């Protein structure tokens, strides 16, 4: 719900300059419409997905140990907090899952390259900031 902290850690995880990755960025079709009120089940799914995304072996390969840990533990509390309040539209939750496969597909295509990873890091930042 409050992605400030996450956004900061993300901006700091950068290793390459996007200004060197001029032929890598991709529009992933973020389903922005599902966040304009925004159902919590789907906030949850967003954070949930981001968490699956960055706790892989490939992730741990790409990012700094310290930063990534702070980042992941934040997602970890966000999740727990979110999860309380989800006591109680599978259409939205689905669009979020799809979007995130478009992302891993991407990463696979690009052989998990540093430039590809920057694209993605930033892509998450965008989605985070657009989810509030």
């Amino acid at each position, epitope marked *: 719900l409050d992605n400030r902290r996450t956004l900061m850690l993300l901006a700091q995880m950068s290793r390459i*300059s996007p*200004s060197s990755c*001029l*032929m890598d*960025r*991709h529009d992933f079709g973020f389903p*922005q419409e599902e966040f304009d009120a925004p159902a919590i089940s789907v906030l949850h799914e967003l954070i949930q997905q981001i968490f699956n995304l960055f706790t892989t072996k490939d992730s741990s390969a790409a990012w700094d140990e310290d930063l990534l840990d702070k980042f992941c533990t934040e997602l970890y509390q966000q999740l727990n907090d979110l999860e309380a309040c989800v006591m109680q539209n599978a259409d939205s939750i689905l669009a979020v899952k799809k979007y995130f496969r478009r992302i891993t597909l991407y990463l696979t295509e690009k052989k998990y390259s540093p430039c590809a990873w920057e694209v993605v890091r930033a892509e998450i930042m965008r989605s985070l900031s657009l989810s509030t």
Partner: single-chain antibody
Amino acid sequence: IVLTQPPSVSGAPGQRVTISCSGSSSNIGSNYVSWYQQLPGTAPKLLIYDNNQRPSGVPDRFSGSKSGTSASLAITGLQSEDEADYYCQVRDNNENEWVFGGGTKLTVLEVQLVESGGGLVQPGGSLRLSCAASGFTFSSYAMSWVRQAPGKGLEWVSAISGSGGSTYYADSVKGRFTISRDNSKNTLYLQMNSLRAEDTAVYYCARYIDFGDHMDFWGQGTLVTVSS
């Protein structure tokens, strides 16, 4: 190669009007779209980026949209000051090139870039363009050159990474032009060789934000004319 908009559109004040951008999916389908506005005489200014995002000072009657393989700029509460040319822009994953639409003439009822070196030359001649940059950390931004021929719309020419290790060119100028950079002196260059009469145009340098999906800032341009 191409990315089409309606050559002209008009509306009355207070009206709402729409400007279409229709592309392939090697570009629009794949990539984030930006829009640029160009008042008569002025350099283009960024108007919409990442499909629907709006820069700082831009009124909110301006909105962007993307739908599979086409973009759309929408203006509401139309006003006489919106009279300008409007350009969509996007990267094309096939050609490894940026590209502008043919533009649309809308008829209504601290950072600095300074290009130099322009001038007048014989076909087959040579010129070197400089762009003096200031008000930001230059190394950290990719740059581009973009030209507008007499009476025509925007055409992307060349681009170069923050470091300098990556360069990109439009077919038009491939191998004749060479984009350079000296980050110790905050200058972008463009060596133009074997000049042609079609190279005639105002040359803008422009600063790429991040992954080069859009450029937020433009110089005022230097005029380059090629005549026998």
